[PDB]
Design a protein around this ligand. Structure first.
Ligand SMILES: CC(=O)Nc1cc(C)[nH]n1
Ligand SMILES: [Cl-]
Ligand SMILES: [Mg+2]
Ligand SMILES: [Mg+2]
Ligand SMILES: [Mg+2]
Ligand SMILES: [Mg+2]
Lengths: 194, 194
């Protein structure tokens, strides 16, 4: 019933553009929407985000997260490791690469979502969520080496999967950080499960 | 270490603006970022709310109430948590219960309310509160609930069993062209991983 008629460019930067989308509402009335798009997509999705499950024997299972300054936010955020998929990269490969660059961990793919939307009222941005396990007892993960690209400055924060939501709340209460909505949603469902 | 130096308007629509953000990197070098913001945020603790609505009914498994709508940024239909922007002066909890009623017909009870969490912090400053709400589906109020759509709202309600959420989402994505929201997928994944 609903569909796009046309798109009018409003403004195009190097990384982000703003468009005015004309669409047909389900009554047959024509309406407009201000929409954001990245300029970098070519790919299954813009990006990947990695759910990294750090597994060490005789330890709690941890979810590995990253803390970074985020200029749109004006502050530090706590997020799953993540980045944009390179032209001709698979989402799995992007996930393992981003995980290694941001955390130093070498992981294995457990599963891969279809393309999921980030904020569909505002943008067309999509990611694959890639669940990855990390064998924390393997030698290659003993002293994990994070490899920043130019202009990346990433702190690693591993938190126990069994108390994830409480630990995140505590970081926000003490550290004045913003938690990512996907991280918080995952944490919630860990608590809400059965 | 890192902080904002300046924020220069590039393009302002009615609903969304683009900005050139100048910030200090942790090496002491000046860098820039293209940042998206909404024009609608006044004194709210966040732009919006998304509601995690747990429908509870005697001799039923618990369901997660979701909504399906056309999203002009995406050019297609998306499956999301019920959500909307917080009106000026409105609390997040009030916004959540209100949006849940408008979008689904259900009258919920507040369970918990997150701190402001970031939607896509590498792109935008947008934040929400994630509000958990229980719905007593045994109450007469919630017997045959009718969405009260606002002007330009056209929302379908989809209730899926919590105990099978990820597979049920996969089966909906396998049957037509639609995108599942990243927060919904994240929450469904943690339900599986728990
Ligand atoms: C250096 C770089 O990637 N800047 C970006 C990304 C976005 C979304 N805005 N600006
Ligand atoms: Cl796992
Ligand atoms: Mg990244
Ligand atoms: Mg990276
Ligand atoms: Mg809505
Ligand atoms: Mg609404």
């Amino acid at each position: 019933k609903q569909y796009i008629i046309s798109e009018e460019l409003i403004s195009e930067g190097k990384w982000v553009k703003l468009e005015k989308t004309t669409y047909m509402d389900p009554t047959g009335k024509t309406r407009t929407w201000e929409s954001v798009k990245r300029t970098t997509r070519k790919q299954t999705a813009d990006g990947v985000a990695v759910i990294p499950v750090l597994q060490r024997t005789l330890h709690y299972e941890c979810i590995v997260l990253v803390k970074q300054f985020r200029p749109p936010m004006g502050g530090y955020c706590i997020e799953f490791p993540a980045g944009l998929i390179d032209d001709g990269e698979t989402p799995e490969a992007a996930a393992l690469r981003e995980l290694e660059e941001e955390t130093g961990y070498k992981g294995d793919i457990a599963e891969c979502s279809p393309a999921v939307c980030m904020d569909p009222g505002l943008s067309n941005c999509t990611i694959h969520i890639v669940t990855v396990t990390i064998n924390g007892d393997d030698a290659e993960n003993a002293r994990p080496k994070p490899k920043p690209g130019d202009g990346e400055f990433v702190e690693v924060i591993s938190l126990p999967k069994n108390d994830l939501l409480q630990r995140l709340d505590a970081l926000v209460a003490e550290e004045h950080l913003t938690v990512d909505a996907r991280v918080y949603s995952y944490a919630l469902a860990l608590k809400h499960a059965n």
